[PDB]
Amino acid sequence: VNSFSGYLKLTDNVYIKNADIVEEAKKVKPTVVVNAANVYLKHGGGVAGALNKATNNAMQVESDDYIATNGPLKVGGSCVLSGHNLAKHCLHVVGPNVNKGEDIQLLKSAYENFNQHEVLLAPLLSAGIFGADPIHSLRVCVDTVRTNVYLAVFDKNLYDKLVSSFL
Numbered sequence: 001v002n003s004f005s006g007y008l009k010l011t012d013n014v015y016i017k018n019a020d021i022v023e024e025a026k027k028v029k030p031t032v033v034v035n036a037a038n039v040y041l042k043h044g045g046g047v048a049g050a051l052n053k054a055t056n057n058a059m060q061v062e063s064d065d066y067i068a069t070n071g072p073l074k075v076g077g078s079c080v081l082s083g084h085n086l087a088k089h090c091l092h093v094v095g096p097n098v099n100k101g102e103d104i105q106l107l108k109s110a111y112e113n114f115n116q117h118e119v120l121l122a123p124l125l126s127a128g129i130f131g132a133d134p135i136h137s138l139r140v141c142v143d144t145v146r147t148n149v150y151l152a153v154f155d156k157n158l159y160d161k162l163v164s165s166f167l
């Protein structure tokens with residue numbers, strides 16, 4: 001049993017809810033929250049900006065030190081950093097950004113990072129401002145992630161379309 005409430009069950013391991021991931025993280029304090037990161041860990045907008053704002057910029061300060069030491073992530077890659085006030089850990093995952101011309105085949109590699117964690121609170125990778133089709137992102141999630149994933153969708157209209165269209 002876990003603390004996640006109000007989710008619709010899509011598969012054995014994938015759950016979905018219309019929710020603000022920031023407000024969900026604050027309530028649950030999950031072991032892992034996933035950030036929709038870029039390779040520079042520059043958290044300016046979208047999920048990254050919303051989570052960073054909720055940490056009072058502490059996520060960005062930590063991230064800048066990580067990049068100064070290690071250099072940029074790979075598209076499809078990840079790193080584990082602090083969850084600050086939101087979670088124990090934040091898994092920063094880089095999905096391909098279609099608005100930068102990145103290979104959408106890298107979305108499966110991105111979701112494979114989730115398999116290193118038994119339970120996660122996450123957004124749909126590459127969806128929203130990353131420019132991918134969220135329906136596609138949910139299909140790749142279900143077909144790639146084997147661990148237990150609780151997906152938060154910010155848009156109510158999109159949530160209803162994701163559920164209604166789910167095969």
Ligand SMILES: Nc1cnc2ccccc2c1
Nearest residue numbers: 020022046047050128154
């Ligand atoms: N409170 C907010 C604001 N913006 C967001 C943008 C993308 C995903 C979630 C968000 C949550």
